[PDB]
Subunit: 505 residues, 4 copies
Amino acid sequence: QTQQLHAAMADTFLEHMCRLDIDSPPITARNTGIICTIGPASRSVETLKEMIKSGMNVARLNFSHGTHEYHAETIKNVRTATESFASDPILYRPVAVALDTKGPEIRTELKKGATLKITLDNAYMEKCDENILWLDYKNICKVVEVGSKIYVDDGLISLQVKQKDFLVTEVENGGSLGSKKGVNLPGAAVDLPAVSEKDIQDLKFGVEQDVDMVFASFIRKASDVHEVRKVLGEKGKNIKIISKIENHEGVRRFDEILEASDGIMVARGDLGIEIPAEKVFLAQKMMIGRCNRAGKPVICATQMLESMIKKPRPTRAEGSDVANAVLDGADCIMLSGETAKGDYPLEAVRMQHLIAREAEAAIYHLQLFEELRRLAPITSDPTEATAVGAVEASFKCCSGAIIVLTKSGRSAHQVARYRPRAPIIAVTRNPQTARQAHLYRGIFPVLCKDPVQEAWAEDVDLRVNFAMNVGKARGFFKKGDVVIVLTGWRPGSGFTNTMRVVPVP
Amino acid sequence: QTQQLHAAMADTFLEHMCRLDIDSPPITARNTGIICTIGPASRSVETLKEMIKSGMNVARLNFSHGTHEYHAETIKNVRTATESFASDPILYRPVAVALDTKGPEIRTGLIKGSGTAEVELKKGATLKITLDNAYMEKCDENILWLDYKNICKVVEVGSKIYVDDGLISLQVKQKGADFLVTEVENGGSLGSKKGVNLPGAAVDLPAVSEKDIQDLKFGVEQDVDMVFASFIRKASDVHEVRKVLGEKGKNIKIISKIENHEGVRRFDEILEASDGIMVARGDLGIEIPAEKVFLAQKMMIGRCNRAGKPVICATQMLESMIKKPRPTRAEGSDVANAVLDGADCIMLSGETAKGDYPLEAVRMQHLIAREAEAAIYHLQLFEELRRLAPITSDPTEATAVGAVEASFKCCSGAIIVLTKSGRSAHQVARYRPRAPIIAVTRNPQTARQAHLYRGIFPVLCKDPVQEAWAEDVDLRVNFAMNVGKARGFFKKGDVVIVLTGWRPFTNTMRVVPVP
Amino acid sequence: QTQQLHAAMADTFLEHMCRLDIDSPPITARNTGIICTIGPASRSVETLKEMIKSGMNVARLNFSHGTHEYHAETIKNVRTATESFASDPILYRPVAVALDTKGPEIRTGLIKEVEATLKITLDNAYMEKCDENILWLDYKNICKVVEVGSKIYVDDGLISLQVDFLVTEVENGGSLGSKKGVNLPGAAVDLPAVSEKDIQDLKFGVEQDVDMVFASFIRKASDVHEVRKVLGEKGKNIKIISKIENHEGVRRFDEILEASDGIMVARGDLGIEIPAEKVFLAQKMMIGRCNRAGKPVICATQMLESMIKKPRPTRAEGSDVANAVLDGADCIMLSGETAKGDYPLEAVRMQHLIAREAEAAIYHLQLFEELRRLAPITSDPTEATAVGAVEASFKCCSGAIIVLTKSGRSAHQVARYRPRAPIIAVTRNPQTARQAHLYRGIFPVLCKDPVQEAWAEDVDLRVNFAMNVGKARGFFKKGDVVIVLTGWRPGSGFTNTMRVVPVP
Amino acid sequence: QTQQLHAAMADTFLEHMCRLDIDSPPITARNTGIICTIGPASRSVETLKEMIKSGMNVARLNFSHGTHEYHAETIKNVRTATESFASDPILYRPVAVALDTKGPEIRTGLIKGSGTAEVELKKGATLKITLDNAYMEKCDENILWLDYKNICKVVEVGSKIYVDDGLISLQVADFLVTEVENGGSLGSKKGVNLPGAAVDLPAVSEKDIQDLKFGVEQDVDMVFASFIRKASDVHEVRKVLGEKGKNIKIISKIENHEGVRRFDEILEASDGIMVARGDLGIEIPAEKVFLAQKMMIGRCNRAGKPVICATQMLESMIKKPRPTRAEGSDVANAVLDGADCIMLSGETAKGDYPLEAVRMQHLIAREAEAAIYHLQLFEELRRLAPITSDPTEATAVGAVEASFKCCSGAIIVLTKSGRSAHQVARYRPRAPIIAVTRNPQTARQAHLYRGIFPVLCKDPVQEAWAEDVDLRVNFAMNVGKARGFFKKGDVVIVLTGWRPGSGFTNTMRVVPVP
């Protein structure tokens, strides 16, 4: 009757669909992380408080615009808002800070059929027109070929190369050209640096400001990830790198990118300029699938609730897009203009919360858990076996939660990859771990502030009890419900090995 | 290499997803019918011809607006445009006509005597709803007239009232005998004759009004192919529509529009009484919480697939294309997922009726649907449809499932089905073959209504019946071969499946090469 | 390259079959319990020691014949043989004692043998004057249970007839002897659940501390309850295995199973009572339902029959044993092969060898998947712990699942999910250690160490005992990973803790 | 309520097992071919007629024993019995003839000069093996002659020697001295096995050459080639059979370890396989035979080539009128494994109850065929199937799919060579496959395939080919009705082609029985 448990019991996916029930209410817990882009509409300490109450887990700062002093003040406000709830550790919600890079860029009426010359000659830097268009990408001729397409201004204008310091092009799709418009080269192996000079300064500032994760723009190959990793350096070795896949080469070389990264963003805006817009859903489902197979976080981004920039309710296509991203297996969903500049930032966050929670209940865990196991390698790793054991146990007794003690987050990540229905309450004393855990579907991170007990086994038990208080206080479960608890046999990371089925006290 | 065949071979759905390939191009054939609402943007014969070339299969006329004179003209234009292609029978594409009823709608009056005028409603402000027809054309930010005379009897203090696609929100503060005082929750621009929803309330308007009766009888006279019946709440609503159509309209398909909570609750009895369903997501997402609409959509599509009845996904699929030359990523996703869900048809409303980019909207649904169709995990879908399908003594059902199985085995260019009533082709469609189903019929209505079924590409044979039956079969089969080749569905040397009768009941399947 | 691991990884059952490899050697462990009927050929202390070394887990006493004095001595010899290994508790193997009842029977009278019409009489005048014209039976209600056309088999199905008197026509003739057993196919035989001899024998069973009763000719749930009632409070811990021997028992199987501790597929009599070509259907149905319920099932009768006379079995016999294991049978049985035959030890060794090969050839991927899907979602902690342990054991290919258990129940719960890894059930309860052999995969070990003062140390001591057994038996070695199940306090019913532990 | 259809619809194999119902009766048709070894007990025309009525589909002649005169007469009698039913083509059942070769056998000599004399060996005693032909007819308790001249080069000290179905066990210039490790009665000309030794006898001996020539002369349908070790053995037999025997099917018998190791290349080269478990279970440990059996049946099912399960399936019925429970189980499980045919050897050749043994195999096969889990079986066959543009394969799979959908009474297939019907059998339909042919050899050889009920149409060819096609289809209808496979009003599937000649099957119809 609740959380689509009738549908959960269907022996086929078709029958599962047939039983989905709008009058079967979901549980309180919402598993999918919500990433909110902060800007003029959401920047104030007072609005940030409401953003957190509405369900924001990660504050994204877009470094395509704004000064370091500007972003430093946004981060300060985020932390002011976040720590205003710190007095009660039971109810405190960690909030992560994400730095999203500008990344490499190419920058500059026009009738269809007309001929346009692209010039790299610096003489035309401030004198672009209907006949000659200057671009700042010096190696463009080396990466394009006759018949190559060139997009200008967020894909509005389309050119085709006819002759390859210059390129003779024919206007395929025409419109009003302007100053400093963005250029995309579909199918081209663009050889711009992994990080611009601006990016290097921005990433170092990210380390200064103690950010949790970096969303690295325009990642094309594993060596781009390694360059971002190198810039973050020893000091930033624990900041998660999320590679943004934005073009054809990124999609083609996705496997090597995933391996080198901590996670992925499906950057649908630019991806739908670089490849045909009708193919974007294929790229999204492929990347979410492969991330799910690897146990690495994946974010669905861009235009998910776009109309809510101007309207208090989303379109039906937007509601569908959010639900389907969750059903695809996205760990996180994202809001951009909707929260950064729109008239309804709080409504947009609340709607993502509501849809995600409904969608999580409609998941067909029977088949999903079955397939994840089948494709899960047999390894000698004790934590992996303990984690799969915990998820299986959680299904067998419909547990209220899986409670996991973790220093680095890894033990909770290993549970998350198996996609339990039960929320995963990850108890840590490491504040960064608490914040970074929002990247993983199902993890509800809690930061334990209690002193270390003198008997280590008592300290373990204290943290488990803290998780029990959190679940009760947040309405995930009640006294007498059964929960799964994951602990280790000695202190320090890498020793999670104990799964217990326990009553909520 | 093509049609996502690498993903097709995966032994798990997760691996199927992992194998989806942006460099694997789809086939030329598009299986999902595209329904276009016709209006000022898309009504001239000139533009209708381009609508057809762009992929329109069904012309939807919304009888919430317009006179019978006007709609008769629209229907004439659709037929003129459709028949302009008749002189090359190989390239002719049947086009269906659908009548969408007004039904039990609630509408506001005119802002200050104008059709275009608007007033700003400010959150927390007061707004009086009146039933007095003196204010019927004198609506403003203070007084709002609506045409539901009994609204007071079905609302209470605290009730919420939604106006203009649920974007303006009011709360009843005080009730009256012939009036309501409300407070604005969600403000915005209020225009003329906007739709009103009372989600809490049991609205007591007739399922089929006197106007609906007039429109349905006009539908019969005009030889429409189908009726989209608005606001269906229960089986008896459908029976009333069916009664008005009567014996003369008995072959017109009734598609029940599900757009309120009762329609969802009573879905099974509605589906049983109907020929098909529309998931009318606009009103549905106001009548129930917007976050639950995807559940109702997937439930209804699943139940229709299971029953073998056409289902249409409708409303705001490509909404931003009313004003913009391309869609948002959420809109792209929505179209693809509707197809992956199992929708037989997808629909465009304002995008084609009134927007700046009607042809572009049609082309985009065409491009997305074709990509989505290739990305279907047929291995599991076909297995489940066969499993959930009763094993019966019906020879035509057995031939149909055999033909679909055969099409998978040789990855055929098509399943060609010779059919008078369309039934044989519908029976093939319900098993969801990858191969396009070329349904060859001499019956014009059969050809038009076939568009309701995923995969059916209807072709109308106009040649006389041959004396020799084998030669008449071969004439129709070769007709399908020539359409398929012309449309690029397949080439000489490819293998196709052909379904016919054996003697002058479809029960013969042949595996034949394309000449 | 070992344990059919290549076939284990196949995505389909067909590919699994195709990868089965006679050159892929099995692990040391053999999961399927071997039940041996004891008799003249295997009754001595010295032969019993070799029977244990050859793989006997349960000694079966057939009470159809033999005195209490006789069976008392057999039991004494079993115990002497079993306890001769008790000095080393790391290598000691528990051996269970099973009492198989004579049960309710229909018998003919004394002749005057005799080689067409034939009248059945209940008239005690014909009691010692049986012949070709008149045959007396001791089942007074036979006329209430049969009808015109109903078949009647005499002497282990050898003779066949078609029907306070009955007039019958001989369908299949033969030599009709004295005091022969009679079967009534399809008939609802209303003989008591427990005969007068059974009552005395079951009392004897309780006095002799037997581990389990194989109750003959169980037709309905109430028959089980009557056996349970006769065993009483003194015998409350004695397991009752219902023998399904006829059509009614098959029809009413679900109710019998619910009331029983386990099931024996008694194929000999079953194949007289129903057409012999249908027995495999009944076997597979009963094994399936028992697996679904997680209750032990034994496959019985003629599994290695030719080995009564010969030192190697027929190919059909090799096949039958393997297929019983592949079907899901917890135990396999030997009757005449070990009781009276010329090659008792060879017969035990052959069941061991075949069982071990067959267990490796199980398609655990699908088996476990199906057991999970059909696994009821309940609030029970021990059930959730058990399935979590089995899932973990597959994920890390563990050397074993170690289970501390007082009653055996915790280990039974693991066994029903059919892990590949051996289940080392460590107990201090000697009877639990003996009874655990009824369950596939359970390797029971009897810990004899004193209860340590600190319970947590006592728990660790027993886990370490299991580690030592596994090392000595070659199940695993230092550094391997095993699964360990324990509870949150002393006493039964509190198993709730699964650990992945390195072997020290 | 019949044919285990309730168990058929189970969503899991476990639930499928749970639903198996002893009160759910099978259909009339029995799909698994029954091969009967003919000998003194079953050789007469009289008995052979009853063997046919009881279900014999193939008569096997074992050329390990008997002269050509003897076998020629057996063959003559098989044909006399078979053709006694030819007057009504509707009821005529084709019977195939199989020649089973001696191959590279090792046999002992005569006990005290007689073929039926025996000496009871005692466990523990000593026994000398000699190659000196002086003793080839004077074997006894103390000296034993063997016919494997080159025996001494291929075995060493401590080697194990097995005699008479591995039942007697022994441990080691032209002799060997041994101690009886397992004793018992020692008879004449018993088979000897050297499991740990590389026996070097020819694939095709002079005797085998003579026998194969005889097989061609006698128009046998198939050869069962003994002790095939590798693909080159199969090619040798194929080449000896040559052009005159080109249409004789070669079934390779797997009876040793090398045969199992090299099974894939053997299968590729053969028309089918026999799992010859008798010797197989001596050459490799007896406990591993089920693994070898299931592997071979699986791989044959995968490749679409006939597989036969052989030896001791109902062994006790040589002396008893009823089989043991292990025997009943073995037959059922061979069918559930996927074996196309099951075999009787001593049970029919020399035993006291040949007809009872044939009847019992018939009863068990039919029960087991209903108990198959077609849902998974068919799904896996479709998935494992190599995907092709072949129209004949598409028509075959569509026909099988259709047969399940309407629980058809039969699949009727017109075929000249048998191939079209073989293509249907490959996908393992529940419905029987009535294969209508005018080719008598096709009719006989079709018995190698699970499900094929071959019928021999003897009507003249009609001028109008379409009417010739409809003629044979209606013959099939008449056969099915007469055999009680279906009645008027039932739905059946019918496969035909678009033109005459082999390779054009492309038409599937779902038709009611007239």
